[PDB]
């Protein structure tokens, strides 16, 4: 096998633009950038075979930069995706982010919105799980959901808006999360009951029990499957406990609900916030 | 018990077919895009053929 | 009691026929998907060949530039349960086939775009010779 | 659901027909074009 | 990025045909229109990146007009489809209609009937849902269904003819809707759930035309030709409606409607047609 | 719009091969045939589905003369679609046959099956339909597409049995079994009964009962047994009773009715020959 370091050195030597008087006699520099990109891709493939995945990613990044200089942006976007795959498999989430961002920018400029949305969602997943940059993850899930909505892909859009609303609610942006849940409801049977519950829970965490009661009434009137659901009864019981200011009754209803339908971590966090708001009002009254 | 099992199997198959409907929608969308790009490809191939022929005549 | 049993018989008869229904679609759909997936295979071969020919074109262009009712209810349910088993199996197989073809179509799209770009490039280069 | 699936696949048959025809047509034109560039190179030398 | 306004101004300057003595020295104007189209497409892409979707649509329309002037009609049809997509995403349903109509006209001219049918159906959907121009939506679904029938796409043809018959029945053209349902039945025979619905809807249209005899014939036909309709709730319901219509008992009809609704929810279409049937009974009582 | 007749006249003028001294100065005639094909395709597009088909046939013939056989095969498929939609089943057959020949020399099974369907339903040329379903099934079998192969072999066995080739139909059902299983066992046995070979039917019954538990307890197995018993007793009335009993629970399709009537007739003929 060729040495990837020597391949990269040859790529670097070829990727120098023609300067000065030589520019009058040299044809388009595009072909030189293409050949430098091919040398970088060969180096990247050899590094990938060696499981030196970060060096493969860096070589694909160099290849994509040369492809951009050649004018071959569609190839650059594909090569950025290969760089991303190498960095993600190598545990270098930062360079994976940067690779996906360049790929997404190329795909959106080329009108490949759906493709860019796929990668924007994966970018959101990296921001959420590996980097814990929840704000940018929110922005990524929102924009991906919008791109899927323009593409009439309701299911993918809903997957993104679920992730967005969940993260917004965990970040304390309860009103905006409730608005996204209202969009998810309008766009949408099993998940619908969950959306009504989560909307109401966000509203309770915003100390707006009236909006929660309205959401309950809306859901009970518009979806018969929510009306007779455990989620509706639970949301009602939580609204009642919030209006009475009884944080113990709320904790009882939470335990009762948890015994039949396990509360996931998101619901527990939001329910704890609601309880804390009740206890704070109790303390402010003594 | 047999009828309840049958009901459970039918509900599961309904779920699988519903998933499939979403997948075939994604497939139809992909195929519409590929038809557009394959039309582009045919046009470009003809254009390349003609240009190469014109250069062949030029060099001759 | 008799009326209810008769209604149950009618319901199960209708259900069986509709079970056999969900079947004709699955077998035809799988047939058509087999045909289309196979029509994709011919496309894939042609795309591979065009990639090779574009490599040749790249090098040639470069050089150029250089130069009784109870029993029936039971039996109808028997028939419905068996068909339901095949409707489930067919749905699973159809899902798997759609997954495979979806990845194949994604690759076909990318390869088609790449070829289109390469052809436009060489056509522009030939225009200047 | 099955009914709709048949219907959608019948629709997609149509796309597959055109794609196959166009890619096949393109391959033959590319082959001819390469032949032309070969003869062009033969003359230019 | 280039300024899209300057790109469009350059497109406009290039897209002037060669007039007069210059026409003797200028080659084909086709290349000038191609370059103007490319400039318009670049402007449209920049507007789309800015989410100025209506301006992107207008730029694609200009590009498609230049492509037509170049003789590149297949490209113009694709560009009209991109204009349509921009206008639809921008909420400008009128320009979306006009874009699709030009694209469909090109596609039909290129013999791409199927493609035009896909877009003619989408045009029908825009006319129905956004513009409420139900008459043109009917015409769109009918013609799309016919084009799909010629393509042997029984399934798409049926989807279109369902939309056509439903809208025709809601517009009071009950006889023509019944005839389309007869076509849907015939195309669906031997292929059943939609079939029961087709039999029911046919009969309901006939009742709304005050022709209970044709409804009874449709019932008998369905009961003989499709055993699933014979034992269905839809058949029993249609029978009960025919009986109530022949007796002139609008209350019994309303009871049968409630009974049916308790087991199989009546959609909005059935409710509208059933109300019309009831009104025709009550009018005969009042007369 | 251009006039399609004038387009075809221009295609015909261009599609004349270079003859004589002109052949020394003219380049390859391939480009002339390509341009004639393009003109024919434009005319076909403007066309009046039968005239569109004929124009596509002319285009495909010019494409063949250019050496672009893959294009010709695609154009023959477009001609086929026009003729089938125009109700001209003969030219649809001829178009599919040319397309299939091109595809096999280089899909053909898909179109060979559709050809079998046209031969069966529109032309009633059942012999060629049988040949089409058999060859399509074989091509799918080589491609390991068991489901499509089985669809073709079902059509082949059904038509062979209706044509009185009961032994060959039974052999195809044996292939289908080895590769609906209950139905295949029943139909195999019925073919054997129509061949007056009740012993082979009993063997098929025993085979099915041993190899597939779902056939063992099925109505199809019991029905086949009862038919074998009635055939061995020579009681055509008992056979008709068992047919009615079976029909009350599982409707006999037209194929089964035809084969069962043949079996009954063979019993009645043996009864008459013994009196």
Numbering used by the authors:
A (entry chain I): 1 to 188, 195 to 292
B (entry chain J): 27 to 86
C (entry chain L): 433 to 499, 589 to 650
D (entry chain K): 213 to 257
E (entry chain G): 1 to 191, 195 to 290
F (entry chain H): 1 to 47, 52 to 110, 115 to 187, 197 to 292
Study text:
After fusion, these bundles are disassembled by the AAA+ (ATPase associated with diverse cellular activities) protein Sec18/NSF and its adaptor Sec17/α-SNAP to make them available for subsequent rounds of membrane fusion.
We prepared the y20S complex in a nonhydrolyzing condition and, after single-particle cryo-EM data collection and processing, we obtained 381,591 high-quality particles that yielded eight three-dimensional (3D) classes into which models were built. In the structures of all eight classes, Sso1 is threaded through the D1 pore of Sec18. The nucleotide states and the arrangements of D1 around the substrate were also the same among all eight classes, with the ADP-engaged E protomer forming the top of a spiral staircase of tyrosine residues. Protomers D, B and C were all ATP bound and formed the middle of the staircase. The bottom protomer, A, formed the base of the staircase.
